Amino acid sequence: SLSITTPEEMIEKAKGETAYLPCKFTLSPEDQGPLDIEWLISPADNQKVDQVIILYSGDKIYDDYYPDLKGRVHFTSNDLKSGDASINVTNLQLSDIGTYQCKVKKAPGVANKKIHLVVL
Amino acid sequence: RTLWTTPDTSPNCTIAQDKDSKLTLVLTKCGSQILANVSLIVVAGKYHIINNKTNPKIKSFTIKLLFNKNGVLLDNSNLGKAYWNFRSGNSNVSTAYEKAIGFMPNLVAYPKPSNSKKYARDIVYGTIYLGGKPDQPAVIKTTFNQETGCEYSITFNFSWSKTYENVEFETTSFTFSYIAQE
Ligand SMILES: CC(=O)N[C@H]1[C@H]([C@H](O)[C@H](O)CO)O[C@@](O)(C(=O)O)C[C@@H]1O
Ligand SMILES: [Ca+2]
């Protein structure tokens, strides 16, 4: 079935640097639907629901979401549809620490990955 | 000379959580080729016990070794620095090395990603066996100089196709070589 490499991952990077958050996926032959990528963050406030970061949908990028990351998050691949939904986060702050989720869908295929990001 | 993790490392690798694995890696310099020997024991966390009946989508994970211009291992590598060093007996020399460019994967042989796709020759594939059982293959895919945020890199990807049920992820050993930077 549809799967993502290293579906739970811990990443550490230093303050001011750029984090590379990998989301490399493998499709199955049955996955003939439209490709849909969603990244989310779990806020440090545990009483707040997850927030959308960035989307790839209908071959377009939508990034007008989580304000703390606005302008700092981008898809890294020049060919995302070939299996690379990775993003980077520029100028890391200590407040960027948290759990990030990549959701890859191509109906009926679905997979998700969680990254625990630590900033030192 | 030999640059290594030692042959019986304490947990030295962080994949899903801190110190969840033991990567054994021995690099021995034979002039312009490095002779390499590798294995993995996962000791805790997501990848420790594989159960694809309960977790059908856990099929692949990656360990990255990132090096600076001096061949020094970077902090954000999955492999930890403390016991990655030149050998002394069955352990390491006491002081951290400052230079190991002669052990780095050659950048002309294996260039970083660019407008050019990396050729397949920048990869070596091997099959290892979980728990030493012949019916429990997994693939180790090793790529040279794939990664960003470093001068050099060695990436180890571990993957499998079979539906493993309660199989501990600890592998047989695999030997390969690569072209040295100098
Ligand atoms: C060491 C080795 O070569 N193992 C191979 C085995 C053995 O030949 C048989 O299990 C023994 O009967 O066969 C496979 O098809 C398997 O079981 O997945 C492929 C695997 O690579
Ligand atoms: Ca939470």
Short mmCIF file of C-alpha atoms and ligand atoms in Angstrom, two decimals:
data_model
loop_
_atom_site.label_atom_id
_atom_site.label_comp_id
_atom_site.label_asym_id
_atom_site.label_seq_id
_atom_site.Cartn_x
_atom_site.Cartn_y
_atom_site.Cartn_z
CA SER A 1 0.00 0.00 0.00
CA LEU A 2 1.00 3.69 -0.07
CA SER A 3 3.83 4.23 2.44
CA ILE A 4 6.23 6.93 3.64
CA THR A 5 9.89 6.44 4.54
CA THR A 6 10.70 6.75 8.26
CA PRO A 7 7.06 7.25 9.31
CA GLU A 8 8.20 8.32 12.80
CA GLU A 9 11.31 10.46 12.82
CA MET A 10 13.22 12.65 15.24
CA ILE A 11 15.09 15.62 13.79
CA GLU A 12 17.35 18.09 15.56
CA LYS A 13 18.74 21.30 14.08
CA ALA A 14 20.26 24.47 15.55
CA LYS A 15 18.50 27.82 15.96
CA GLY A 16 18.78 30.02 12.85
CA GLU A 17 19.35 27.06 10.52
CA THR A 18 17.00 25.46 7.98
CA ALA A 19 15.27 22.19 8.93
CA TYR A 20 14.66 19.62 6.19
CA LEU A 21 11.53 17.62 7.01
CA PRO A 22 11.48 14.52 4.75
CA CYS A 23 8.27 13.02 3.41
CA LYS A 24 9.31 10.58 0.70
CA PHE A 25 6.47 8.34 -0.44
CA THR A 26 5.99 5.19 -2.48
CA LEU A 27 2.74 4.57 -4.37
CA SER A 28 1.02 1.28 -5.11
CA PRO A 29 -0.45 0.52 -8.59
CA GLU A 30 -4.01 0.91 -7.19
CA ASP A 31 -3.35 4.57 -6.23
CA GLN A 32 -4.94 6.18 -9.29
CA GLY A 33 -6.81 9.03 -7.60
CA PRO A 34 -5.72 12.67 -7.21
CA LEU A 35 -2.52 13.37 -5.26
CA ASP A 36 -3.16 15.31 -2.04
CA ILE A 37 -0.43 16.39 0.42
CA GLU A 38 -1.16 18.04 3.77
CA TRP A 39 1.30 19.14 6.45
CA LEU A 40 0.12 19.98 9.99
CA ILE A 41 1.65 21.05 13.30
CA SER A 42 0.53 20.25 16.84
CA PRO A 43 0.66 23.57 18.79
CA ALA A 44 2.66 23.76 22.04
CA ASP A 45 -0.69 24.64 23.64
CA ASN A 46 -2.02 21.10 24.16
CA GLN A 47 -5.58 22.48 24.39
CA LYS A 48 -5.39 23.72 20.77
CA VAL A 49 -6.17 21.43 17.82
CA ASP A 50 -3.62 20.79 15.07
CA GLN A 51 -3.09 23.57 12.55
CA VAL A 52 -2.54 23.30 8.81
CA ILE A 53 0.89 24.42 7.54
CA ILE A 54 0.96 23.85 3.75
CA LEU A 55 -0.92 21.88 1.07
CA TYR A 56 -0.34 20.43 -2.35
CA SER A 57 -3.69 19.83 -4.00
CA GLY A 58 -4.86 19.81 -7.63
CA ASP A 59 -1.21 20.37 -8.62
CA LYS A 60 -1.20 23.69 -6.74
CA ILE A 61 0.48 24.83 -3.52
CA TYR A 62 -1.58 26.51 -0.80
CA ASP A 63 0.39 28.12 2.02
CA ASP A 64 -1.83 30.77 3.64
CA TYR A 65 -2.17 28.89 6.96
CA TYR A 66 -0.23 28.70 10.30
CA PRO A 67 0.91 32.36 10.83
CA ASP A 68 4.10 31.51 12.81
CA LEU A 69 5.44 29.61 9.78
CA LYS A 70 4.09 31.87 7.02
CA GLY A 71 6.84 32.58 4.47
CA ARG A 72 9.28 30.17 6.16
CA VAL A 73 7.90 26.85 4.84
CA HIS A 74 8.29 25.53 1.28
CA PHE A 75 8.11 22.23 -0.57
CA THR A 76 11.68 21.30 -1.53
CA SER A 77 11.25 18.98 -4.53
CA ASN A 78 11.18 20.16 -8.13
CA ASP A 79 9.05 17.08 -8.84
CA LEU A 80 6.81 16.45 -5.82
CA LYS A 81 4.43 14.07 -7.65
CA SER A 82 7.32 11.62 -8.22
CA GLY A 83 7.38 10.78 -4.48
CA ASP A 84 8.84 13.73 -2.56
CA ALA A 85 6.55 15.82 -0.32
CA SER A 86 9.40 17.10 1.86
CA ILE A 87 9.40 20.65 3.21
CA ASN A 88 11.93 22.93 4.76
CA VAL A 89 11.55 25.46 7.54
CA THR A 90 13.91 28.44 7.42
CA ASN A 91 15.43 30.48 10.28
CA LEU A 92 14.52 28.03 13.04
CA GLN A 93 13.31 29.44 16.33
CA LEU A 94 13.04 27.59 19.66
CA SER A 95 9.26 28.06 19.31
CA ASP A 96 9.36 25.78 16.22
CA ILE A 97 9.89 22.75 18.49
CA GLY A 98 6.99 20.33 18.10
CA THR A 99 5.42 17.45 16.22
CA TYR A 100 4.88 17.93 12.48
CA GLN A 101 2.72 15.61 10.39
CA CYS A 102 2.86 14.83 6.67
CA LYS A 103 -0.26 13.22 5.15
CA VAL A 104 0.01 11.73 1.66
CA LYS A 105 -3.11 10.64 -0.18
CA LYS A 106 -3.72 9.26 -3.65
CA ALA A 107 -7.10 7.53 -3.50
CA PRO A 108 -7.53 4.85 -2.30
CA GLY A 109 -3.94 5.10 -0.95
CA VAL A 110 -3.20 6.95 2.30
CA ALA A 111 -0.22 7.23 4.64
CA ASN A 112 1.02 9.56 7.35
CA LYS A 113 4.30 10.49 8.97
CA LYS A 114 5.15 12.28 12.20
CA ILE A 115 8.36 14.23 12.86
CA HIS A 116 9.46 15.36 16.29
CA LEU A 117 11.51 18.50 15.66
CA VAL A 118 13.94 19.77 18.27
CA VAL A 119 15.69 23.14 17.91
CA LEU A 120 18.86 23.72 19.95
CA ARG B 1 43.48 3.07 9.08
CA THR B 2 40.01 2.34 10.40
CA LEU B 3 37.30 4.86 11.27
CA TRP B 4 34.47 3.13 13.12
CA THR B 5 31.60 3.00 15.63
CA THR B 6 33.58 0.34 17.58
CA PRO B 7 32.46 -3.29 17.15
CA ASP B 8 30.07 -3.41 20.14
CA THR B 9 28.63 0.09 20.38
CA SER B 10 26.18 1.25 23.03
CA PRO B 11 23.14 2.91 21.43
CA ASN B 12 24.60 5.47 19.03
CA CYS B 13 21.79 6.21 16.63
CA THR B 14 18.53 8.13 16.80
CA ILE B 15 15.84 7.31 14.23
CA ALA B 16 12.38 7.69 15.83
CA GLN B 17 13.54 8.60 19.35
CA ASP B 18 16.85 9.33 21.12
CA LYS B 19 19.34 6.45 21.18
CA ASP B 20 16.91 3.91 19.75
CA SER B 21 19.48 2.01 17.70
CA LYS B 22 23.01 0.66 17.35
CA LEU B 23 24.61 1.24 13.97
CA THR B 24 27.80 -0.75 13.51
CA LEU B 25 29.92 0.80 10.75
CA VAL B 26 33.57 0.06 10.02
CA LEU B 27 35.40 2.05 7.34
CA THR B 28 38.87 0.85 6.39
CA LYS B 29 40.92 2.85 3.95
CA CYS B 30 42.43 0.87 1.07
CA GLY B 31 43.94 3.83 -0.75
CA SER B 32 41.31 5.36 -3.02
CA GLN B 33 38.65 2.81 -2.04
CA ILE B 34 37.01 2.57 1.35
CA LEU B 35 36.08 -0.96 2.43
CA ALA B 36 32.90 -0.69 4.50
CA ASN B 37 31.05 -3.15 6.76
CA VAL B 38 27.63 -2.31 8.23
CA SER B 39 24.80 -3.71 10.36
CA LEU B 40 21.97 -2.41 12.52
CA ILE B 41 20.40 -3.40 15.84
CA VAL B 42 17.26 -1.43 16.73
CA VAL B 43 16.93 -1.41 20.52
CA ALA B 44 13.78 0.65 21.24
CA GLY B 45 10.96 2.61 19.65
CA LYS B 46 8.97 2.39 16.43
CA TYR B 47 11.38 0.17 14.52
CA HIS B 48 12.39 -2.21 17.32
CA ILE B 49 9.77 -4.93 16.79
CA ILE B 50 8.16 -5.04 13.36
CA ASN B 51 4.53 -6.06 13.25
CA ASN B 52 3.01 -5.41 9.84
CA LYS B 53 -0.27 -7.05 10.79
CA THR B 54 -0.88 -4.26 13.32
CA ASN B 55 1.19 -1.63 11.48
CA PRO B 56 0.98 -2.42 7.74
CA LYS B 57 2.62 0.83 6.60
CA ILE B 58 5.92 0.57 8.47
CA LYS B 59 8.11 -0.62 5.58
CA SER B 60 11.13 1.69 5.31
CA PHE B 61 13.36 3.96 7.40
CA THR B 62 16.55 5.96 6.90
CA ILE B 63 19.75 6.75 8.82
CA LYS B 64 21.93 9.69 7.68
CA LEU B 65 25.62 10.37 8.31
CA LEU B 66 26.42 14.00 7.47
CA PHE B 67 29.99 15.32 7.34
CA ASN B 68 31.61 18.73 7.10
CA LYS B 69 34.55 19.74 4.84
CA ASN B 70 37.00 18.13 7.28
CA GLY B 71 35.11 14.82 7.29
CA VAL B 72 33.82 15.49 10.82
CA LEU B 73 30.39 14.08 11.66
CA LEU B 74 27.68 16.75 12.07
CA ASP B 75 25.45 16.89 15.18
CA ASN B 76 22.23 16.51 13.27
CA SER B 77 23.27 13.15 11.79
CA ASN B 78 21.28 10.16 13.02
CA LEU B 79 24.58 8.65 14.18
CA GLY B 80 26.03 10.20 17.36
CA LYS B 81 29.56 11.55 17.55
CA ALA B 82 30.86 10.28 20.89
CA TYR B 83 32.01 6.82 19.74
CA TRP B 84 32.62 7.55 16.05
CA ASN B 85 36.39 7.80 15.76
CA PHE B 86 39.67 6.24 14.70
CA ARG B 87 40.23 2.87 16.31
CA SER B 88 42.45 1.99 19.23
CA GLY B 89 42.27 -1.76 19.93
CA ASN B 90 38.58 -2.63 20.28
CA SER B 91 37.72 0.95 21.20
CA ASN B 92 38.65 4.44 19.93
CA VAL B 93 41.46 6.92 20.46
CA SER B 94 40.65 9.27 23.39
CA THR B 95 40.39 12.53 21.48
CA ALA B 96 37.86 13.34 18.78
CA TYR B 97 39.34 13.33 15.29
CA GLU B 98 39.77 16.61 13.42
CA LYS B 99 40.33 15.31 9.87
CA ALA B 100 39.04 12.32 7.90
CA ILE B 101 38.74 13.62 4.34
CA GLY B 102 40.37 10.41 3.07
CA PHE B 103 37.29 8.49 4.29
CA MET B 104 34.69 10.71 2.65
CA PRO B 105 32.70 9.59 -0.42
CA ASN B 106 34.28 11.23 -3.49
CA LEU B 107 32.29 14.27 -4.72
CA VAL B 108 33.29 13.80 -8.38
CA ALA B 109 32.25 10.12 -8.21
CA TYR B 110 29.04 10.93 -6.33
CA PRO B 111 28.03 14.57 -6.83
CA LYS B 112 25.41 16.35 -4.72
CA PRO B 113 21.96 16.80 -6.29
CA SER B 114 22.02 19.53 -8.94
CA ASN B 115 20.23 20.21 -12.23
CA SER B 116 21.54 16.70 -13.00
CA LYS B 117 19.74 13.72 -11.49
CA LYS B 118 22.20 11.56 -9.55
CA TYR B 119 23.21 8.48 -11.52
CA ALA B 120 22.28 5.10 -10.10
CA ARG B 121 25.99 4.32 -9.57
CA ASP B 122 25.85 6.58 -6.49
CA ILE B 123 23.84 3.78 -4.82
CA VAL B 124 24.79 0.29 -3.64
CA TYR B 125 22.08 -2.27 -2.77
CA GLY B 126 22.51 -5.27 -0.46
CA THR B 127 20.18 -7.75 1.20
CA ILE B 128 20.57 -8.49 4.91
CA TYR B 129 18.56 -10.84 7.15
CA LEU B 130 16.59 -9.98 10.27
CA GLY B 131 17.53 -12.16 13.23
CA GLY B 132 19.87 -14.04 10.89
CA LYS B 133 16.87 -15.97 9.49
CA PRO B 134 17.08 -16.74 5.76
CA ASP B 135 13.34 -16.13 5.24
CA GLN B 136 13.53 -12.63 6.74
CA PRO B 137 15.25 -10.48 4.08
CA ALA B 138 15.41 -6.70 4.21
CA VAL B 139 17.10 -4.37 1.77
CA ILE B 140 19.90 -1.99 2.72
CA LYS B 141 20.18 0.81 0.15
CA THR B 142 23.27 2.99 0.61
CA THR B 143 23.53 6.32 -1.22
CA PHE B 144 26.58 8.59 -1.35
CA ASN B 145 26.27 12.38 -1.18
CA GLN B 146 22.50 12.66 -1.43
CA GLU B 147 21.97 15.01 1.49
CA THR B 148 21.77 18.76 2.00
CA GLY B 149 23.36 20.76 4.86
CA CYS B 150 26.75 19.02 4.66
CA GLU B 151 29.82 18.62 2.47
CA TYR B 152 29.54 14.81 2.31
CA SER B 153 26.94 12.22 3.29
CA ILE B 154 26.30 8.49 3.57
CA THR B 155 22.61 7.53 3.72
CA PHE B 156 21.42 4.04 4.77
CA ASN B 157 17.85 3.14 3.93
CA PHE B 158 16.37 -0.08 5.37
CA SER B 159 13.22 -1.47 3.78
CA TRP B 160 11.26 -4.71 3.42
CA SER B 161 8.31 -6.13 1.45
CA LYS B 162 7.18 -9.11 3.51
CA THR B 163 4.52 -8.84 6.19
CA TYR B 164 6.65 -9.42 9.30
CA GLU B 165 4.87 -10.26 12.54
CA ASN B 166 6.80 -9.57 15.75
CA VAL B 167 10.23 -9.66 14.12
CA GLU B 168 13.00 -7.84 16.01
CA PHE B 169 14.96 -5.50 13.73
CA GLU B 170 18.54 -6.67 14.13
CA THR B 171 20.47 -7.47 10.97
CA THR B 172 23.25 -9.56 9.50
CA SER B 173 26.33 -7.67 8.22
CA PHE B 174 26.96 -6.35 4.73
CA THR B 175 30.20 -5.31 3.02
CA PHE B 176 30.52 -2.73 0.27
CA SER B 177 33.05 -0.22 -1.00
CA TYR B 178 33.13 3.30 -2.35
CA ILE B 179 35.53 5.75 -3.97
CA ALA B 180 37.36 7.99 -1.45
CA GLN B 181 37.59 11.78 -1.79
CA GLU B 182 41.39 11.62 -1.49
C1 LIG C 1 19.48 -16.17 2.56
C2 LIG C 1 18.58 -16.13 1.36
O1 LIG C 1 19.04 -16.18 0.23
N1 LIG C 1 17.27 -16.01 1.62
C3 LIG C 1 16.21 -15.97 0.62
C4 LIG C 1 15.15 -17.01 1.00
C5 LIG C 1 15.68 -18.43 1.20
O2 LIG C 1 16.29 -18.86 -0.03
C6 LIG C 1 14.56 -19.39 1.60
O3 LIG C 1 13.70 -18.80 2.58
C7 LIG C 1 15.11 -20.68 2.19
O4 LIG C 1 14.19 -21.73 1.87
O5 LIG C 1 14.11 -17.03 0.02
C8 LIG C 1 13.36 -15.82 -0.12
O6 LIG C 1 12.45 -16.01 -1.22
C9 LIG C 1 12.53 -15.52 1.12
O7 LIG C 1 12.29 -16.43 1.95
O8 LIG C 1 12.09 -14.36 1.28
C10 LIG C 1 14.32 -14.66 -0.43
C11 LIG C 1 15.53 -14.60 0.52
O9 LIG C 1 16.43 -13.59 0.06
CA CA C 2 -0.08 18.16 21.96
#
